[PDB]
Amino acid sequence: EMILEEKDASDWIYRGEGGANLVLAYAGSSPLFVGKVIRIQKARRSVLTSDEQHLWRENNELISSPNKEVLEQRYVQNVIIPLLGPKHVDAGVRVSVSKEFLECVDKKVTKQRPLWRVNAANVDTSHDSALILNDHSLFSQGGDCISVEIKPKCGFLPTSRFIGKENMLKTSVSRFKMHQLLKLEYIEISEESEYDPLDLFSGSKERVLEAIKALYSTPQNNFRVFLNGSLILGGSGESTGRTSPEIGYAFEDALKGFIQSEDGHRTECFLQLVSDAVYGSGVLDRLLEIQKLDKLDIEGAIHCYYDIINQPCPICREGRPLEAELSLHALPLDESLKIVKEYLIAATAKDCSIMISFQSGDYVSLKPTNQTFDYKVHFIDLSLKPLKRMESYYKLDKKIISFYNRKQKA
Ligand X SMILES: O=P(O)(O)O[C@H]1[C@H](OP(=O)(O)O)[C@@H](OP(=O)(O)O)[C@@H](O)[C@@H](O)[C@@H]1OP(=O)(O)O
Binding site membership: which residues? Answer: 18-21, 39, 44, 117, 134-136, 149-151, 153, 183, 221, 224, 303, 313, 316, 329, 351, 381, 385, 389, 393
The site map against ligand ANP for 84-123 (x = CB under 6 A) is ----------------------------------------
Site for Zn ion in 267-306 (CB under 5 A): 303
CA separation for the pair 154, 393 (Å, rounded): 14
Using CB under 6 A as the binding rule, whether residue 197 contacts ligand ANP is answered as: no
Counting contacts by CB under 6 A, is residue 348 touching ligand ANP?
Answer: no
Determine the 3-state secondary structure of 135 from DSSP. coil
b/e burial code for range 204-241 (CB count within 10 A of at least 16 → b): eeebbbbbbbbbbbbbbbbbbbbbebebbbbbebbbbe
Under rule CB under 6 A, residue 380 binds ligand ANP? yes
Report the distance separating Cα 382 and Cα 328, nearest Å.
29
Chain length of the chain: 410
Does 136 sit near ligand ANP (CB under 6 A)?
yes
Which helix (DSSP H) or strand (DSSP E) does residue 287 occupy? helix 283-291
Residue closest to ligand X, measured at CB: 19
Residues in binding site for ATP: 18-21, 39, 134-136, 149-151, 224, 381
Maximal CA-CA distance, the chain? 68
Q: Which does 313 bind (CB under 5 to 8 A by kind): ligand ANP, Zn ion, ligand X, none?
A: Zn ion
- Rule CB under 6 A: say whether 243 interacts with ligand ANP: no
19 near ligand X, judged by CB under 6 A:
yes
| Binding at 167: pick from Zn ion, ligand X, ligand ANP, none (beta carbon under 5-8 Å per type) | none
What's the sign of the alpha-carbon dihedral 97, 102, 103, 107? positive
Site string for Zn ion, 312-341 (x = CB under 5 A): -x-xx-------------------------
**Contacted entry of ligand ANP, ligand X, Zn ion, none for residue 297, CB cut-off 5 to 8 Å set by kind:** none
What residues pair up with 16 in beta bridges, in sequence order? 23
Q: Which does 221 bind (CB under 5 to 8 A by kind): ligand X, Zn ion, ligand ANP, none?
A: ligand X
37 makes contact, choosing from ligand ANP, ligand X, Zn ion, none, with CB < 5 to 8 Å by partner type, with: ligand ANP
Stretch that binds ligand ANP, among 3-11, 128-136, 153-161, 175-183 (CB under 6 A): 128-136
Task: Determine which residue in the list 16, 18, 158, 234 makes contact with ligand X, applying CB under 6 A.
Answer: 18
The nearest distance, CB 251 to ligand X, in angstroms, is 22
Shortest distance, CB of residue 96 to ligand ANP, whole angstroms?
Answer: 20
Please choose, from the candidates 269, 261, 271, 282, the residue with its C-alpha nearest in 3D space to the C-alpha of residue 362: 282
Applying the rule CB under 6 A, the residues between 288 and 317 that interact with ligand X are none
* Whole-number Å distance between alpha carbons of 158 and 323: 19
E strand or H helix that includes residue 340? helix 333-351
Distance separating alpha carbons of residues 230 and 212, to the nearest angstrom:
20
Under DSSP, is residue 204 helix (H, G, I), strand (E, B) or coil? coil
Do 338 and 363 form a contact (C-beta atoms < 8 A)? Answer: no
252 near ligand ANP, judged by CB under 6 A: no
Subset of 148-177 contacting ligand ANP (CB under 6 A): 149
Q: Is 382 helix (H, G, I), strand (E, B) or coil?
A: coil
Amino acid code (one letter) for 304: C
Nearer to ligand X, 221 or 369 (CB): 221
What is the gyration radius of the CA atoms in the chain, in angstroms? Answer: 22
Q: Which of 245, 184, 250 is nearest to 217 (CA)?
A: 245
